[PDB]
C-alpha cells in the first residue's frame, strides 16, 4: 500500500581504480556495512579521487568513469538511481536506456578523462581489478581482446573505460561478446555518443 512503499537506494562510490602512478590497482574506500548505510541515506562524506570509481548498489557492483566533468556508468547497473554525495542524493543529469548510459555531475575531487580525438584503433580496457587489457577497435562500438578471457574476468567492470594509447577516453564498457563463456570481444558506448548526450 502507499504508506509502506520503499524507495531504491543510491549508487555509492566504494573505491576507485588507481591509474596515477606506474602501477594500476584497485582501492576500496568503503566497506559493505558503510555502503549499505550510505545507499539508504544518500549522504557520502568520503573523499573522492581519480577517474574511475568502483560503485555499488545494494545488489550490484560495477564501475563509473568521469569524462568532461560527468561521472558516467551503465543503465543496467545504475537504473535511474541517485548517487550518494556529501550533501545528500544527487539526481542523474543524463539517463538514456537506449544507450545503456547514465551520468551524474562528477564528484568534487574526481579527475576527468578527455574524449579521444586520435582516431586510433589500439585501445586498452580497465577492469575493476585494475587489469589493463589491450583491445583492438573493430567498429564503432566493438573491440576484440588480444587475449580472450572467461567472462568471469570481466563481470563487474561495465561502466569502466576504454582508453587510447595517450590515455584519452574512447568509450564506456557495456557488454561482453562471449562464446561458451569466453569473451573474445567487448561492446562499448563510444565517447562521441556521450559527447552528443552532453
Ligand X SMILES: CC(C)(C)OC(=O)N[C@H]1CCCCC/C=C\[C@@H]2C[C@@]2(C(=O)NS(=O)(=O)C2CC2)NC(=O)[C@@H]2C[C@@H](OC(=O)n3cc4cccc(F)c4c3)CN2C1=O
Instruction: List the binding residues for Zn(2+).
Output: 116, 118, 164, 168
Report how far residue 130's alpha carbon sits from residue 157's, in angstroms, rounded to the nearest whole number. Answer: 10
CA distances from 37 to 9, 11, 34, 134, 155 (A): 9, 11, 5, 37, 25
Q: Verify binding: residue 62, ligand X, rule CB under 6 A.
A: yes
The answer to whether 10 and 78 are in contact (CB under 8 A) is no
Question: CA 33, CA 138: separation in Å to the nearest integer?
Answer: 42
C-alpha 114/C-alpha 97 separation (Å) is: 24
In the numeric block, the cell 543503465 is attached to 75
177 binds ligand X (CB under 6 A): yes
Q: Is 42 a catalytic residue?
A: no
174 binds ligand X (CB under 6 A): yes
156 binds ligand X (CB under 6 A): yes
76 is catalytic: yes
Stretch that binds ligand X, among 14-22, 24-32, 106-114, 154-162 (CB under 6 A): 154-162
123 in contact with Zn ion (CB under 5 A): no
Which one of ligand X, Zn ion, none is in contact with 166 (Cβ closer than 5 to 8 A by kind)?
Zn ion
Q: Is 116 in the site for Zn ion (CB under 5 A)?
A: yes
How many chain residues are in contact with ligand X, going by CB under 6 A?
20
Secondary structure of residue 120 in the 3-state scheme: coil
Are the beta carbons of 114 and 68 closer than 8 angstroms? yes
Confirm whether 156 is a catalytic residue.
yes
**Binding site residues, as ranges?**
116, 118, 164, 168
Under rule CB under 6 A, residue 143 binds ligand X: no
- Which one of the listed residues 156, 159, 160, 171 is annotated catalytic? 156
CA dihedral 153, 156, 161, 163 (to 10 degrees): 0
Pick out residues in 77-136 that bind ligand X (CB under 6 A): 77, 99-100
Residues at the interface with ligand X (CB under 6 A): 60, 62, 74, 76-77, 99-100, 151, 154-158, 173-178, 187
Amino acid at each position: 500500500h502507499m504508506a509502506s512503499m520503499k524507495k531504491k537506494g543510491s549508487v555509492v562510490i566504494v573505491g576507485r581504480i588507481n591509474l596515477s602512478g606506474d602501477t594500476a590497482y584497485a582501492q576500496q574506500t568503503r566497506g559493505e556495512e558503510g555502503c549499505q548505510e550510505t545507499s539508504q541515506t544518500g549522504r557520502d562524506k568520503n573523499q573522492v579521487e581519480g577517474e574511475v570509481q568502483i560503485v555499488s548498489t545494494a545488489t550490484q557492483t560495477f564501475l563509473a568513469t568521469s569524462i568532461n566533468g560527468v561521472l558516467w556508468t551503465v543503465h543496467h547497473g545504475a537504473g535511474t538511481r541517485t548517487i550518494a554525495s556529501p550533501k545528500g542524493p544527487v539526481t542523474q543529469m543524463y539517463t538514456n536506456v537506449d544507450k545503456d548510459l547514465v551520468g551524474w555531475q562528477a564528484p568534487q575531487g574526481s579527475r576527468s578523462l578527455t574524449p579521444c580525438t586520435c582516431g586510433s584503433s589500439d585501445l586498452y580496457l580497465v577492469t575493476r581489478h585494475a587489469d589493463v587489457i589491450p583491445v583492438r577497435r573493430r567498429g564503432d562500438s566493438r573491440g576484440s581482446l588480444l587475449s580472450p578471457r572467461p567472462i568471469s574476468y570481466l563481470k563487474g567492470s561495465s561502466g569502466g573505460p576504454l582508453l587510447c594509447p595517450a590515455g584519452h577516453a574512447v568509450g564506456i564498457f557495456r557488454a561482453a561478446v562471449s562464446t561458451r563463456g569466453v569473451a573474445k570481444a567487448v561492446a562499448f558506448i563510444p565517447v562521441e555518443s556521450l559527447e552528443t548526450t552532453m
